[PDB]
């Protein structure tokens, strides 16, 4: 017996990255998993490096970030790499989630990797939000103020909880130091959950774009998917290069280059682009508590896809109506994103409400109806 199989430690690597049996027909959308692993590694490397130069005290934080940009050798690169990779992390995560929804990766027997995945997505949001605060520019402060005052909507104890999270009566030094500690920690938790969702997936293996079993025709993960992963790694690094070296501030907001000033409020407090759809959902509900619940429900509702998809067939490759519905769902999710950054003015107020209804009605009405009808069409249509 070969050492890679005999030795317990080597065998675990072997089972995941080398002899792992994969379907032979995964397409390029199965490459986002490894890109997300690459983003996670870049964020750990750049993150730990910035932590060696950053000072978490509110009197010095913003200046420490300027020191990184101006004095540390390649500090500009490390800072922009870290900031831009956070955007790429969300592009890849939305793609990976989109792949999973389109191809029915959430169906049995893969409900558990999917459900852990939904938690990974929540941790990523929290991680990225805390990191944004650490700069302690105007968007940092006003972000922490607004978002932590949503917690005030929790009945009875909400106000108390806010003051407890801030460590005082406003966002200030205690808040900044605790966000630093948590921002450092959260990526490690996120890595553990990423590993859990893979271990959960190992029982069934990867789904594939046809939605049929692959037990009939498997390929080793290495070398075939190793070499296919390199193509998207280099494509990713090309995109990374264009942002980091040529347009490092394109995805960001100028207001964060102004030091936090509790008096002056910025013109518009909008979150980072990747949070914008959830922000639009929150604005849609007029009630404070209602809005918060809706915004959380917009993420947690993904947990019910295994129930509401009633199809006897896995995924959308062969389902024309489901494909149309999915197209509309995805475009609506982008429109929500755009409405997250417009002003609260006519006619965008009502439009945002309609888009919010459409978002939820996909999970609660349309997907159950459409999947039921397609079942009947496949049966009658093939008689």
């Amino acid at each position: 017996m070969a050492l890679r199989k005999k030795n317990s430690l080597l065998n675990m690597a072997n089972s995941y990255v080398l002899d792992s049996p994969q379907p032979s027909n995964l397409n390029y959308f199965w490459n986002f998993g490894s890109l997300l692993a690459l983003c996670l590694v870049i964020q750990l490397a750049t993150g730990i490096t910035l932590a060696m130069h950053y000072t978490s005290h509110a009197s010095l934080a913003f200046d420490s970030v300027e020191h990184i940009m101006r004095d540390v050798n390649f500090g500009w690169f490390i800072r922009y790499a870290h900031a831009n990779t956070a955007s790429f992390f969300f592009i890849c995560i939305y793609a990976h989630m989109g792949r999973n929804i389109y191809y029915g990766s959430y169906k049995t027997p893969r409900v558990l990797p999917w459900s852990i995945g939904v938690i990974i997505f929540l941790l990523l949001i929290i991680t990225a939000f805390m990191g944004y605060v650490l700069v302690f520019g105007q968007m940092s402060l006003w972000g922490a103020t607004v978002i932590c005052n949503l917690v005030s909507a929790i009945p009875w104890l909400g106000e108390d909880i806010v003051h407890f999270l801030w460590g005082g009566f406003s966002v200030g030094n205690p808040t900044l130091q605790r966000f630093f500690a948590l921002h450092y920690l959260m990526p490690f938790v996120l890595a553990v959950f990423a590993l859990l969702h893979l271990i959960a997936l190992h029982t069934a293996g990867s789904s594939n774009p046809l939605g049929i079993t692959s037990n009939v025709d498997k390929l080793s993960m290495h070398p075939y998917y190793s070499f296919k992963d390199l193509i998207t790694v280099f494509a990713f690094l090309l995109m990374f290069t264009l942002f980091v070296f040529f347009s490092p501030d394109k995805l960001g907001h100028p207001d964060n280059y102004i030091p936090a000033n509790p008096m002056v409020t910025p013109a518009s407090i909008v979150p980072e682009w990747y949070l914008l759809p959830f922000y639009a959902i929150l604005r849609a509900i007029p009630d404070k508590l209602g809005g918060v619940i809706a915004m959380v429900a917009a993420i947690l509702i993904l947990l019910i896809l295994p129930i509401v998809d009633r199809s006897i067939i896995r995924g959308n490759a062969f389902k024309p109506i489901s494909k149309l519905l999915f197209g509309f769902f995805i475009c609506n999710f982008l429109l929500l994103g755009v409405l997250g950054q417009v002003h609260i003015e006519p006619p965008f107020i009502v439009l945002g409400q309609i888009c919010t209804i459409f978002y939820f009605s996909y999970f609660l009405i349309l997907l159950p109806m459409v999947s039921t009808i397609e079942n009947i069409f496949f049966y009658i249509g093939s008689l």
């Binding site: 509790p262 008096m263 409020t265």
Partner: protein, 111 residues
């Protein structure tokens, strides 16, 4: 007279308003006010206007007694606040915020 107490970095305007000042503030119809509020909503004690003296526009501190509604005038972009510290004229959207203040004694307030 109007005092300026720093409290959590923000200035606090404390004005000891006269009888006729109170009267002047109680006049303006709530209807015609960017931020509609009456003095009774603002003060817990009519002789103690206590406000957070940051202008609601960008965040300069209004010069008191100046204005056009004889309360506070932000010199930065020329916004005029009232004797209630309500916004009347200029770029500022809101009335000057009221802190949580309590009269522990009748001669001392805690903010």
């Amino acid at each position: 007279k109007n005092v300026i107490i720093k409290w959590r970095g923000k200035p606090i305007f404390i004005r000891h308003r006269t009888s006729e000042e109170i009267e002047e503030a109680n006049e303006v119809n709530v209807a015609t006010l960017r931020d509609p509020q009456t003095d009774d909503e603002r003060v817990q004690k009519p002789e103690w206007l206590v406000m957070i003296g940051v202008c609601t526009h960008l965040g300069c501190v209004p010069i008191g007694e100046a204005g056009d509604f004889g309360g506070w005038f932000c010199p930065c972009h020329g916004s005029h606040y009232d004797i209630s510290g309500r916004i009347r004229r200029g770029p500022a959207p809101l009335n000057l915020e009221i802190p949580e203040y309590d009269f522990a004694d009748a001669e001392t307030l805690v903010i």
